[PDB]
mmCIF file with all atom_site columns, C-alpha atoms in Angstrom:
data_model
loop_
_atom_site.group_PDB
_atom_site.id
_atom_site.type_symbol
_atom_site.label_atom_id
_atom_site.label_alt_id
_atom_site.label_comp_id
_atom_site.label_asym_id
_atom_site.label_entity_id
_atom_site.label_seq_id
_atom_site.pdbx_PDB_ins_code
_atom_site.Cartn_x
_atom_site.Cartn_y
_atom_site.Cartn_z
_atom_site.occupancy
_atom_site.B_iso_or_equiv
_atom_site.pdbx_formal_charge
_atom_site.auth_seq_id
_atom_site.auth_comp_id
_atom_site.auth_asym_id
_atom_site.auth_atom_id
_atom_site.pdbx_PDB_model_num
ATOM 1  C CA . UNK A 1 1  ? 104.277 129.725 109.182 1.00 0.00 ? 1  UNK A CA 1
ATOM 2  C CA . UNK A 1 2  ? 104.888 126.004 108.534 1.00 0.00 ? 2  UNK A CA 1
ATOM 3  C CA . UNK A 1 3  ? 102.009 123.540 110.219 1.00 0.00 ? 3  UNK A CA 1
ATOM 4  C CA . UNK A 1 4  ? 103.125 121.055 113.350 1.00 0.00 ? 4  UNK A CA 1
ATOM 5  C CA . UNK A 1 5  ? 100.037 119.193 111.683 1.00 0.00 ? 5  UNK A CA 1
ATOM 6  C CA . UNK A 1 6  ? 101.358 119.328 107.992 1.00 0.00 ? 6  UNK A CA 1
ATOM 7  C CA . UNK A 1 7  ? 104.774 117.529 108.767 1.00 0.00 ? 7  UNK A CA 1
ATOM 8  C CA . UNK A 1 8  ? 102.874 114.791 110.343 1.00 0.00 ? 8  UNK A CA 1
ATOM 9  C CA . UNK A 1 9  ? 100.831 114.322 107.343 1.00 0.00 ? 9  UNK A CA 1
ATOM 10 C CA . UNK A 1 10 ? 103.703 113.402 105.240 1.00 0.00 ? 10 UNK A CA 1
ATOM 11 C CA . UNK A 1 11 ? 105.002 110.290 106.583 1.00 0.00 ? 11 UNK A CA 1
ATOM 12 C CA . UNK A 1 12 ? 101.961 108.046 105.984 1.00 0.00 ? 12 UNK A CA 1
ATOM 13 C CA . UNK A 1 13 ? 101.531 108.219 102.034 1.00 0.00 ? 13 UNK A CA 1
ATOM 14 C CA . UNK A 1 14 ? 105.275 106.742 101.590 1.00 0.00 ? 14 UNK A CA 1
ATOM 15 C CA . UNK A 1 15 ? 104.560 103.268 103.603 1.00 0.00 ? 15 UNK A CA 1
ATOM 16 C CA . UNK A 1 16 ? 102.231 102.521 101.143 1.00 0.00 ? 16 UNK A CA 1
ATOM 17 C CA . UNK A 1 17 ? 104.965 101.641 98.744  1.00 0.00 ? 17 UNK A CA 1
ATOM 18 C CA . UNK A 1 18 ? 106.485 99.099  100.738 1.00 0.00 ? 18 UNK A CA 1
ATOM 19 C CA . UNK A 1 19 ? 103.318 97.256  100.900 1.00 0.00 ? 19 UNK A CA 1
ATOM 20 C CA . UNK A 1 20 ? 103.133 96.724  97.219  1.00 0.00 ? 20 UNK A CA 1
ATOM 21 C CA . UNK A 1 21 ? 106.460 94.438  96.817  1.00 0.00 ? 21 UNK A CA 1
ATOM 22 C CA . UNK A 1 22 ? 105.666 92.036  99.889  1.00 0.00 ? 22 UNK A CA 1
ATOM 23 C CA . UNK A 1 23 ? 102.727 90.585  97.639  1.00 0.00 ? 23 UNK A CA 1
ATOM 24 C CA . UNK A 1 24 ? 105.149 89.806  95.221  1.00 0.00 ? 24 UNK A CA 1
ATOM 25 C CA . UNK A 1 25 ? 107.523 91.832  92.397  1.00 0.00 ? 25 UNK A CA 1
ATOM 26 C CA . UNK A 1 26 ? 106.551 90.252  88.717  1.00 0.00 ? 26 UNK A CA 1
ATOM 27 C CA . UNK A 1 27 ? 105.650 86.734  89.108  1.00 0.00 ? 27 UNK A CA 1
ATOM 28 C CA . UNK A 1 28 ? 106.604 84.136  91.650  1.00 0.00 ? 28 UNK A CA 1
ATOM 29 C CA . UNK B 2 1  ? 102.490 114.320 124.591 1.00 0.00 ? 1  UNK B CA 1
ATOM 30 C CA . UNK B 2 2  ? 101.243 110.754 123.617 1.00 0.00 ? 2  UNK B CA 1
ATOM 31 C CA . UNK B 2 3  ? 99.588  111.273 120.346 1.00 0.00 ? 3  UNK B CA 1
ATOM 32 C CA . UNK B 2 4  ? 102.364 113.319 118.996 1.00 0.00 ? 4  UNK B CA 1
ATOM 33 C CA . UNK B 2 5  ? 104.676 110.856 119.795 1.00 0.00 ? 5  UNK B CA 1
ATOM 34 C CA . UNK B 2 6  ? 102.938 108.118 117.604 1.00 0.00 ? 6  UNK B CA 1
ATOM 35 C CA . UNK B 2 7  ? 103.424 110.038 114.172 1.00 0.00 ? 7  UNK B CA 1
ATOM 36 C CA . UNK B 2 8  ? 107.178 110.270 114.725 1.00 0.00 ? 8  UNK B CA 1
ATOM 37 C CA . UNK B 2 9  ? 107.241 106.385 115.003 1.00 0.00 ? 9  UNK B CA 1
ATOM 38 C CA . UNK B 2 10 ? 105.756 106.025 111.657 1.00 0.00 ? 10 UNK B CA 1
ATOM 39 C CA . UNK B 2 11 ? 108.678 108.087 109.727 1.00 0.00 ? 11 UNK B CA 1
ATOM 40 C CA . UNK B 2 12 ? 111.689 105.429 110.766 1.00 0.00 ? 12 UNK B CA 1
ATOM 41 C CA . UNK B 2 13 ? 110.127 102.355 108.894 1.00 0.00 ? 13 UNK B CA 1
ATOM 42 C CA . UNK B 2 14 ? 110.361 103.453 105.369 1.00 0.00 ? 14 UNK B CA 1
ATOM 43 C CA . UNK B 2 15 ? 113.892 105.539 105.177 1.00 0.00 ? 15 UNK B CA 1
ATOM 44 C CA . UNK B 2 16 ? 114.949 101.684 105.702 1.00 0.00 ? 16 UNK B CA 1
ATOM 45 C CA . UNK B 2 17 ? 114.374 100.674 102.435 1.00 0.00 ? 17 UNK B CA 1
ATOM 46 C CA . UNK B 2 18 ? 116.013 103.440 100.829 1.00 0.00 ? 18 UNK B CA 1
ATOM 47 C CA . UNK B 2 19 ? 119.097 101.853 103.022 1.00 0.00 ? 19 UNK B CA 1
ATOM 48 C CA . UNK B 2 20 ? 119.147 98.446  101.173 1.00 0.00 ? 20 UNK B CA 1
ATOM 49 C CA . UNK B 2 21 ? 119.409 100.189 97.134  1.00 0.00 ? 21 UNK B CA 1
ATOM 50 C CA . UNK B 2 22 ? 122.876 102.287 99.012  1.00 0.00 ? 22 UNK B CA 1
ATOM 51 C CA . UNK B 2 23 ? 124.376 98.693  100.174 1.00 0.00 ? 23 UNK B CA 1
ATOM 52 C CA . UNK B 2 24 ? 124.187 97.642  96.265  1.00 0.00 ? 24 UNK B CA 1
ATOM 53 C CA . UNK B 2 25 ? 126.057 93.975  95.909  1.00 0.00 ? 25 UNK B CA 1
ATOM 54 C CA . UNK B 2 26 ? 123.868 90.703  95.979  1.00 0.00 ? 26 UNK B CA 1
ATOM 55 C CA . UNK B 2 27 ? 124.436 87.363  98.154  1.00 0.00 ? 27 UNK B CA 1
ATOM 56 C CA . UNK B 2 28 ? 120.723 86.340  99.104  1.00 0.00 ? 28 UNK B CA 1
ATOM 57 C CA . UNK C 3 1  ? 116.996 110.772 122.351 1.00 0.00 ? 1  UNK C CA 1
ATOM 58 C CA . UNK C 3 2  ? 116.140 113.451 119.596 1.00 0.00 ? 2  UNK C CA 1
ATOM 59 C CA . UNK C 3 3  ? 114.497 116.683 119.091 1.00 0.00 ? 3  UNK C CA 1
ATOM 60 C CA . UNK C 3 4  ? 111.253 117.480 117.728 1.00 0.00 ? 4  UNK C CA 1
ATOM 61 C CA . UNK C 3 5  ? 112.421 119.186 114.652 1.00 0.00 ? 5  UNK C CA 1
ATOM 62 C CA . UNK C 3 6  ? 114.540 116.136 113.831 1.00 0.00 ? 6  UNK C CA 1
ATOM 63 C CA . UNK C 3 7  ? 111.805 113.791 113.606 1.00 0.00 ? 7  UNK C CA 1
ATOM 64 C CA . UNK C 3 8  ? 110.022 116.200 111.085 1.00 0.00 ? 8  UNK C CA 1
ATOM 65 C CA . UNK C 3 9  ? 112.660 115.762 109.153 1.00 0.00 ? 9  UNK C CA 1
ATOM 66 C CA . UNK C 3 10 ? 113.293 112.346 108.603 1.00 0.00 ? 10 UNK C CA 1
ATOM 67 C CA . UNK C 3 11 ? 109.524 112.223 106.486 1.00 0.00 ? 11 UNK C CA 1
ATOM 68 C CA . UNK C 3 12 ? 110.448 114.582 103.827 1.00 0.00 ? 12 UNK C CA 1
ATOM 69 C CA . UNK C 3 13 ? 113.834 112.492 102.219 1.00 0.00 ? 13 UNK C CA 1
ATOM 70 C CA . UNK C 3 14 ? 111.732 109.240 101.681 1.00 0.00 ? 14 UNK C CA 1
ATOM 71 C CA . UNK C 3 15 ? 108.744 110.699 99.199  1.00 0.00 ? 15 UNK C CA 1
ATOM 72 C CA . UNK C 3 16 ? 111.786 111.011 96.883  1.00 0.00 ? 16 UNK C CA 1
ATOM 73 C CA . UNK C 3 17 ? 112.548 107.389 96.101  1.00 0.00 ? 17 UNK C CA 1
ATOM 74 C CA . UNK C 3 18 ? 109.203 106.889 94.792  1.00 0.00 ? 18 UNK C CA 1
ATOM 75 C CA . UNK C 3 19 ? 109.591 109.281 92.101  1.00 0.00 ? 19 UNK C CA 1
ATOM 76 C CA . UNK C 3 20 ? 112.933 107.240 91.119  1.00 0.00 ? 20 UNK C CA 1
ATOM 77 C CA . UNK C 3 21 ? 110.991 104.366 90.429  1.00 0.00 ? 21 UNK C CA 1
ATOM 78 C CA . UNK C 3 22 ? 108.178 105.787 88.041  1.00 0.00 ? 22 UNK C CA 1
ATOM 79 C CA . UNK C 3 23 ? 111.578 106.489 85.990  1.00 0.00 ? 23 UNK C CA 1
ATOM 80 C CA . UNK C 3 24 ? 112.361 103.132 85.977  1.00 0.00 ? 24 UNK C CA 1
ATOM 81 C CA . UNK C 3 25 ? 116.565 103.039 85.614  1.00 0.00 ? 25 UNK C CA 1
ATOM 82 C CA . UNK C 3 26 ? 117.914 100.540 83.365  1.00 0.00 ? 26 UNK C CA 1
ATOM 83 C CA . UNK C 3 27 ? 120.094 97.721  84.628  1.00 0.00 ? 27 UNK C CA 1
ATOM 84 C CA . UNK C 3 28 ? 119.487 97.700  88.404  1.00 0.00 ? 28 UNK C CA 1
#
C-alpha cells in the first residue's frame, strides 16, 4: 500500500548534494 | 492538480549530475 | 508528456550516487 505522499518525499534530500560542490571542491 | 505537479519538477535536476560521471573524458 | 508513475520513478535512482561518494573510489 505504497504512499502518493512518500514518493514525493524522496526527491528533496538528494539536491542537497549538489549544493555542496558549487561553494567550492577542496580549495580554490 | 497544481501542487502535485510541483514535486515532479524537483526530481529532473539532480539525475543530471549523475549524467556528467557516465560522459567520463575531460576538455574543460 | 509522461505518466504519473514515471515521475515517481525518476527520485529513487539518484539517492544512490551519494552513497558512491562516502566510498570515495580511487583515481577518478
Amino acid at each position: 500500500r505504497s504512499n502518493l505522499g512518500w514518493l514525493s518525499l524522496l526527491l528533496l534530500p538528494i539536491p542537497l548534494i549538489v549544493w555542496v560542490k558549487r561553494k567550492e571542491v577542496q580549495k580554490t
